[PDB]
Design a protein around this ligand. Structure first.
Ligand code: NAI
Ligand code: NAI
Ligand code: NAI
Ligand code: NAI
Ligand code: NAI
Ligand code: FPK
Ligand code: FPK
Ligand code: FPK
Ligand code: FPK
Ligand code: FPK
Lengths: 278, 278, 276, 276, 278
């Protein structure tokens, strides 16, 4: 149904997130690549070359992206967002849905800037992650003061085409950022280290990478399809006296769990500072 | 459209692994549940009740499993394998392919036991993991002395229906056990801790669990479908000065990578003891 | 079990704890229990006297009175005891060894030199049998009749949890529930110190910490849910509990308790490796 | 207390735990209890329905039914609740706040704007009231009659330990027995992992570890002796237990539990510092 | 042959410290127990029952203690001192010497309270410790603005009967609190741990406790009676290659010395907060 809606989508910013979302949306068949336009003052990026190869329209002029779009994603660094809103705020129209993907930036700050121009800007804040590029993203969104009920449902339909999507209260989004926004990086670090461990124990690197990634994918999928606690799933792998429980002990002795808690906390706290500095 | 109409499968042992594989095989459609039989001296097990509901035939007698089966999975704890082989060795026939899933137990030790009863037993050793239950397992196998080329091909066909499967030299299997065999437990531990971090920062536990698992699944899928190094994918998530690179620093400060190397090593080393004692 | 006579070789902490639990339970009157020790001026001996237990310095007298005979001496003393009373075992006897680490095989070997078919059971229990909340496992020997294991389970269930195990599990049980009360007492003392640091009187802090641990343990015993699921019910988002759990994780709290069970289990095996 | 009607604002974990403990105790029939929550499709709501508790989406209905009204919503929601139902308090009412950190002063301030003399009690309890082994403290407000504190203690004693405290102790109690069950569940999971590492089946390891902690806590509650003296009774010289205690000490085990009580207490105060 | 026949002593507070001092004074023979009175709002205290058995007069009313007493010890918790001074300030007479034992509470704050009722209150501040109960305390005192020279001499005479006593400038007392006031607790902790070490190595607990305590008592006495540096005495016990120097190395490896410095510092710093808040 979204395809026949023939939506025009725009991205202010043409970097990693714009590429990941554009690739996921077109892979999902919801959007035609040429119905997406992205803007950036820097075309010498690999992301821009990849978007061009996809068939996405590219332009240096953010105003052109605004005029083209029905749904406008803000995909620039947090400190760039106020600059962006000053530049194209006069060009936001009643028809637009403005979707901010920027870490930390509040709906209130966005509506404050845009309401100086037209009085009821339709704003949605979201946080997502790069696995939308394989349509396995983890996305949350919050609706602003003037977003219609149909605006939230449209956003959920669009973002559900590239992974999990659910509405939340805005005060949860900084924490989501620390968990699933930054989460793929924690997983890539873990997969690299698990592969090093495989290689230390005699496996070829290529096989160690493949096996570790498949292990993590399958374990995550079991948890998503199970009602059981992750400790109960872990118990089903931990035979008495066996290999797994010996490995779990050395993780515990290093405070493995605490490091992952530290990471979510550190990303969430930094996300809050990215807003305060803007 | 795969289906083994002439294959009768039996499990010696009716525990977690027998349930995971039988559930995966029946979900994949490659085997009808009534062509599978499992034996265990304990029918008051939660996995026996679950196998019964699928339609798997069950018996207390290991000899009946052998007599019913062409492909015979040994799904008992490593120290039980020698008793099992003594019990049913005289019942092994030309048609049997014996597939040992036990951690650490060598092909040579199994062939030596079964050869006392009848020369040329057809033995395959495999290592898999519990995510075969959602058809996302990671499986390796090695062929024994008397396995025919068609036996390994058939086992790869069967095990590929529930996840990744590839042939390896037997001397890699203890290390695979430490990486992908124990791997799901490392992932469950990591997901439990990531959720704790989400809860600390204000997320409801249910949502934190869902988002953490979705982030790990998506990242693993990105790696499996990419030609790039986990570090390059990680670089795409680590914007300069951003939330993610701040979180990655606190992981590095605790030696996060070294803990996962420690874990693979400890599981691999213990697996070799679940045999050197044997 | 109404005409059953019970003896303890050794009149120390465990014999007191079991005899107190047994008599509180009603399953044994104190006058059916005898205990022996070479030192009648002991504190536990004085306590057993007050309860109505019969006391003798002579281990032979304990044996002649007893149907069920508990060995409650230190592990390195078991061989000496078996050499002293071996000629007095009488086929009516069930010999129940409580000593950490000492195998059924080593007991049957010493006793078989005197009479061929000694009925031996090995158990591991803990001091909370004194308030009838012990945790006990037992394994039956080569010549223990089926009714021997059943009588043992009837008796020990009166003072806490009791189940039969294979003998090769008992050293690990020792490291978990045998030593476990000491882990709990250490934890309770530290939790109380934490309460005192934040301004609670010591007596209130001890009471509250102990009541919290008892209640949580009961909750888990009465639940089918994973301990992590019960923990999630207490960890409200952003709240006080999840902040405390983080500082426990950061110190490797879980790993220390794993270390402890392991160290106790390994030492238990060592006590027997050096015995044999 | 036979014509006493009780309400809960909030129908979550604590309301379930208290209502289950109260009805198991016999002190309250389920039909004298009403609970309200904006989400009737909740798991705890479904459980309270099965027990016989009356449920409504409307907090005003809970207030009109109740004599004793428990506030069992998250701390940041208390001010909203008081603004919604303040005009409905009726002088027959005793308002019992269970929320972590929220002071009697802030509750009396919000309610006094509607009617001058609200009868307020603040308590801190824990989830083991669900098996009638909770640990509860309470402090009486400015307008709580003497009989108000006595009725409160009668009710909460039916589900565990209960004593009156000065309000300035309650944040510390929160860090000790309020959060304490989570420390115990974490410890029980780790002790079980230790049992499994040394070869025990998981189900046996969970049962034994939980039984050991329950029994030890009971022993201390029934003793006048210091927790170190009880620990000495388990630490035989050269034995398995003292080897395990050493590895706990070497990891700073005691300090981690002090850290935990402190961190929970401090966070509790912070939740109120940010409220006010 | 010391005895204060004209001195009536009172304690505001009837807890650990009042019991320790009254027991020490009566054991030293310098005061008859019936010339001592103590007040507390709680008679169900174990220290009240003990004071009663010695023959100390007891009352719930602090005003009666003041009216009976010449030397008045304030033996209540620091935050109770201002309430106490408000309650009985109007009852302070020319004859009274007010001796505050409360941690952290300054002479200036006590004189300011009592001066509102009657000018020139005679105030002494002391820090002592529980071993006065065995006449081996460590006590310091500072004299207030209106204390006469004979008041300090008399207090030194009295406090010397239960241990070491010396006059100090008031600004040393918070540090003395961290060293010898809290000191006995460090020693009890050390003795409990030394006994645990003896038990680990095979000693019965009773004997380990006796030997550890005797070793600490003897070593402290050697130092007090020697003109030599604790290091020189330590060198006499550390034979080359021997048992002791091996044990000293493992203490050094854990930073043993730094922990005790940390403790004195933490107690001193907290003591200053038990007043800066006041
Ligand atoms: N990379 C990720 O994993 C995710 C990123 N985000 C958020 O998405 C936003 C962008 O992140 P990345 O795309 O990773 O950054 P990136 O740095 O790859 O791309 C940034 C883009 O913005 C462009 N840009 C700079 N100034 C501009 C201007 N004045 N007008 C238009 N475009 C301008 C840059 O040229 C570049 O194309 C950030 O706010 C980040 O928090 C959120 C979810 C995940
Ligand atoms: N659980 C896992 O994650 C995986 C386990 N494995 C291997 O699978 C084997 C079994 O693992 P789980 O199924 O997890 O064990 P499990 O303990 O869940 O099931 C063990 C089964 O063996 C049965 N059994 C015991 N004695 C028997 C006998 N004499 N004859 C027949 N059945 C008997 C038990 O009753 C139970 O049904 C082990 O060797 C393990 O190394 C390999 C890969 C992953
Ligand atoms: N205390 C505990 O927490 C538990 C201890 N155990 C086992 O119980 C046994 C005893 O432990 P405790 O009772 O704690 O020791 P304990 O030292 O309190 O009592 C030992 C008793 O043995 C007596 N004894 C010494 N030589 C003797 C002899 N030749 N003949 C007779 N009695 C003699 C001593 O006089 C003393 O009364 C040990 O083997 C220990 O492993 C098992 C589980 C729990
Ligand atoms: N869970 C525990 O271990 C204990 C919790 N507490 C306190 O109990 C209070 C509740 O804790 P839990 O019950 O664990 O939270 P919970 O989240 O399980 O239940 C919270 C309930 O409040 C309801 N709620 C939300 N907004 C509401 C509104 N406007 N009107 C009425 N109900 C509303 C929710 O629907 C939910 O049913 C918190 O203040 C916590 O500090 C105190 C001691 C122990
Ligand atoms: N315990 C120690 O090791 C030493 C304590 N101190 C100081 O001694 C003072 C008391 O210490 P402890 O005796 O250990 O306290 P404690 O708590 O054992 O005794 C305190 C006494 O004060 C009483 N009290 C409370 N309110 C009162 C009031 N309004 N009027 C009269 N009495 C009242 C209590 O009932 C109790 O009898 C504290 O200021 C402490 O800093 C100084 C040196 C060492
Ligand atoms: O029991 C489960 N597993 C998973 C792989 C190895 C084996 C073990 O832990 O011994
Ligand atoms: O740039 C990528 N990401 C992922 C989530 C938040 C953002 C950051 O690190 O600031
Ligand atoms: O949510 C549960 N609890 C238990 C006591 C304090 C509160 C919290 O964690 O904030
Ligand atoms: O002495 C007491 N106990 C408890 C179980 C093992 C034994 C020991 O420490 O050796
Ligand atoms: O030389 C002194 N000492 C003291 C005790 C043992 C001996 C030593 O250190 O070897």
């Amino acid at each position: 149904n979204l395809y026949f809606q023939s939506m025009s989508v725009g991205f202010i910013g043409a970097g990693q997130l714009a590429f990941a979302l554009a690739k996921g949306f077109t892979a999902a068949g919801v959007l035609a690549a040429h119905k997406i336009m992205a803007s950036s003052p820097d075309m010498d990026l690999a992301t821009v070359s990849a978007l061009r190869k996809m068939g996405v329209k590219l332009t240096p002029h953010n105003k052109e992206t605004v005029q083209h779009s029905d749904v406008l994603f803000l995909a620039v660094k947090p400190h760039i967002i106020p600059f962006i809103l000053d530049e194209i705020g006069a060009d936001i129209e009643d028809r637009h849905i403005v979707v901010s993907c920027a870490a930390g930036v509040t709906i209130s700050s966005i509506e404050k800037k845009l309401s100086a121009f037209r009085p009821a800007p339709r704003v949605i804040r979201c946080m997502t992650n790069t696995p939308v590029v394989v349509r396995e993203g983890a996305t949350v969104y919050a609706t602003g003061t003037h977003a219609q009920v149909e605006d939230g449902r449209l956003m959920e339909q669009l973002l559900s085409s590239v992974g999990f999507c659910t509405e939340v209260e805005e005060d949860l989004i900084d924490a989501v950022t620390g968990l699933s926004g930054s989460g793929p990086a924690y997983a890539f670090t873990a997969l690299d280290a698990l592969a090093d461990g495989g290689v230390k124990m005699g496996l070829p690197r290529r096989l160690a990478v493949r096996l570790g990634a498949q292990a993590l994918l399958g374990a995550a999928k079991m948890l998503l399809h199970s009602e059981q606690h992750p400790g109960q799933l872990k118990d089903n792998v931990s035979s008495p006296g066996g290999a797994t429980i010996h490995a779990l002990h050395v993780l515990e002795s290093g405070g493995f769990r605490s490091l992952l808690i530290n990471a979510v906390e550190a990303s969430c706290i930094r996300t809050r500072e990215l807003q305060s500095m803007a």
